[PDB]
């Protein structure tokens, strides 16, 4: 997990809010959930990745997480 690729990171964000998803959503080894969180926050402040919304480019990438908004 590298703060420099916002794509992988932006997978574990909510598209609408920009929240970081929990384990019970992402389904990660505690180790990786942690790596992901830290990488995210780093990216967000170094100015790679937007904070309040998932960057629209990456909207159509593969959906790893278990959440369903639209029902």
């Amino acid at each position: 997990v590298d703060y420099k690729n916002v794509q992988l990171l932006s997978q574990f964000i909510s598209p609408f809010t920009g929240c970081i998803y929990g384990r019970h959503i992402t389904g990660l080894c505690g180790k990786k959930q942690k790596e992901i969180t830290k990488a995210i926050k780093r990216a967000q402040i170094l100015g790679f990745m937007p904070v309040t919304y998932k960057d629209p480019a990456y909207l159509k990438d593969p959906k790893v997480c278990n959440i369903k908004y639209r029902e």
Binding site: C19, P50, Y53, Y69, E71
Partner: protein, 86 residues
């Protein structure tokens, strides 16, 4: 504020039915806890008080989770009983 506008917490309405769009929005916000957070930030809540809440919530969740698990495990045996009037 420095982010681009209209990309976030935005829902577009379909075939002009607004009630439905709004419902979808409200579900988005409920799901991410934004609603509870908004509500809880109206007043302040002192740290110990918050610690206590988190702990109570997690207990509550553990219990509900486990009860649910036992329900869905026991669920098979609700079927009509074979041995009736033994």
């Amino acid at each position: 504020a420095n982010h681009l506008k209209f990309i976030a917490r935005t829902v577009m309405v379909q075939e002009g039915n607004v009630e439905g769009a709004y419902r979808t929005l409200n579900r988005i916000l409920t799901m991410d806890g934004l609603i509870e957070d908004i509500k809880r930030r109206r007043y302040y809540e002192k740290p110990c008080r918050r610690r206590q809440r988190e702990s109570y919530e997690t207990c509550r969740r553990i219990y509900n989770m486990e009860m649910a698990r036992k329900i869905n495990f026991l669920m098979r045996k609700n079927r009509a009983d074979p041995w009736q009037g033994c």
